[PDB]
Design an enzyme around this catalytic site. Structure first.
Site, PDB file in Angstrom:
ATOM      1  N   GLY A  45       0.800  -1.167   0.024  1.00  0.00           N
ATOM      2  CA  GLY A  45      -0.036   0.091  -0.093  1.00  0.00           C
ATOM      3  C   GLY A  45       0.844   1.018  -0.031  1.00  0.00           C
ATOM      4  O   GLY A  45       2.026   1.247   0.312  1.00  0.00           O
ATOM      5  N   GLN A  50       2.954   9.922   1.801  1.00  0.00           N
ATOM      6  CA  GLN A  50       4.275   9.593   1.888  1.00  0.00           C
ATOM      7  C   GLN A  50       5.060   9.755   0.564  1.00  0.00           C
ATOM      8  O   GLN A  50       6.475   9.678   0.917  1.00  0.00           O
ATOM      9  CB  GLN A  50       4.132   7.930   1.775  1.00  0.00           C
ATOM     10  N   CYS A  90       5.934  -0.493   7.324  1.00  0.00           N
ATOM     11  CA  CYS A  90       5.682   0.891   6.618  1.00  0.00           C
ATOM     12  C   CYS A  90       6.787   1.276   5.980  1.00  0.00           C
ATOM     13  O   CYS A  90       8.033   1.223   6.582  1.00  0.00           O
ATOM     14  CB  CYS A  90       5.215   1.926   7.856  1.00  0.00           C
ATOM     15  N   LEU A  91       6.563   1.810   4.599  1.00  0.00           N
ATOM     16  CA  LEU A  91       7.677   2.183   3.764  1.00  0.00           C
ATOM     17  C   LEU A  91       8.393   3.399   4.482  1.00  0.00           C
ATOM     18  O   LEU A  91       9.524   3.515   4.066  1.00  0.00           O
ATOM     19  CB  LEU A  91       7.029   2.503   2.341  1.00  0.00           C
ATOM     20  N   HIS A 132      -4.582   1.232   7.753  1.00  0.00           N
ATOM     21  CA  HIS A 132      -3.161   1.819   7.807  1.00  0.00           C
ATOM     22  C   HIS A 132      -2.835   2.993   6.421  1.00  0.00           C
ATOM     23  O   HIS A 132      -2.234   4.277   6.907  1.00  0.00           O
ATOM     24  CB  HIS A 132      -2.117   0.662   7.461  1.00  0.00           C
ATOM     25  N   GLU A 133      -3.386   2.738   5.344  1.00  0.00           N
ATOM     26  CA  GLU A 133      -3.166   3.920   4.498  1.00  0.00           C
ATOM     27  C   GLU A 133      -4.158   5.012   4.713  1.00  0.00           C
ATOM     28  O   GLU A 133      -3.760   6.179   4.331  1.00  0.00           O
ATOM     29  CB  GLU A 133      -3.497   3.478   2.945  1.00  0.00           C
ATOM     30  N   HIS A 136      -2.503   7.107   7.151  1.00  0.00           N
ATOM     31  CA  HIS A 136      -1.541   8.156   6.615  1.00  0.00           C
ATOM     32  C   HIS A 136      -1.728   9.444   5.770  1.00  0.00           C
ATOM     33  O   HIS A 136      -1.278  10.512   5.985  1.00  0.00           O
ATOM     34  CB  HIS A 136      -0.692   7.677   5.314  1.00  0.00           C
TER      35      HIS A 136
HETATM   36 FE   LIG Z   1       2.900   3.083   5.752  1.00  0.00          FE
END
Ligand SMILES: [Fe+3]
Length: 165
Positions: A45, A50, A90-91, A132-133, A136
């Site tokens: 995702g 981000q 998480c990225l 989670h997305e 963000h």
């Molecule tokens: Fe993330």
């Protein structure tokens, strides 16, 4: 194009995204670059926040074969139920994972890549990924659910990794 993904600490990760006014060619191009970025960085995702694009755009693909593109533009949570949790990564928080409480099932409404509204009911990994997305886009990260100490240790670990470059 593969875009640069912001890493903590970075205040831009705490910005609240504005809704997309119109799904046009430019928005489609962002969706496409976000998927390219998500796959290149090996994620399931990615929220626009981000990659420093503060509009309500999310791309997701939780499929085994990496061929199920889900686009959530201006998503709205309609219902949720149950509780669950997995050790999320998480990225924007490289190599750190932690169990976080989430609803087990969610129902959302959003616009797809063509600007068409649709509703989606999800459970399991997909429900967790959607939450989670969506977090963000309102400047919330999964570490925010953890104790202050854990947050400190997570931040220190990422800073170290990024120093080693
Ligand atoms: Fe993330």
């Amino acid at each position: 194009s593969v875009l640069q993904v912001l890493h903590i600490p970075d205040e831009r990760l705490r910005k609240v995204a504005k809704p997309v006014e119109e799904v046009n060619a430019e928005i489609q191009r962002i969706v496409d670059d976000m998927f390219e970025t998500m796959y290149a960085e090996e994620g399931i995702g990615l929220a626009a926040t981000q990659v420093d694009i503060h509009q309500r755009i999310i791309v997701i693909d939780v499929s085994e074969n990496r061929d199920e593109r889900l686009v959530l533009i201006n998503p709205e949570l309609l219902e949720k139920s149950g509780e669950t949790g997995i050790e999320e990564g998480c990225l924007s928080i490289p190599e750190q994972r932690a169990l976080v409480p989430r609803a087990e099932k969610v129902k959302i409404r959003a616009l797809d890549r063509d600007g068409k509204p649709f509703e989606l009911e999800a459970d399991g990994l997909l429900a967790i990924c959607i939450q989670h997305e969506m977090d963000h886009l309102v400047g919330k990260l999964f570490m925010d659910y953890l104790s202050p100490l854990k947050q400190q240790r997570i931040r220190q670990k990422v800073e170290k990794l990024d120093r080693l470059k």
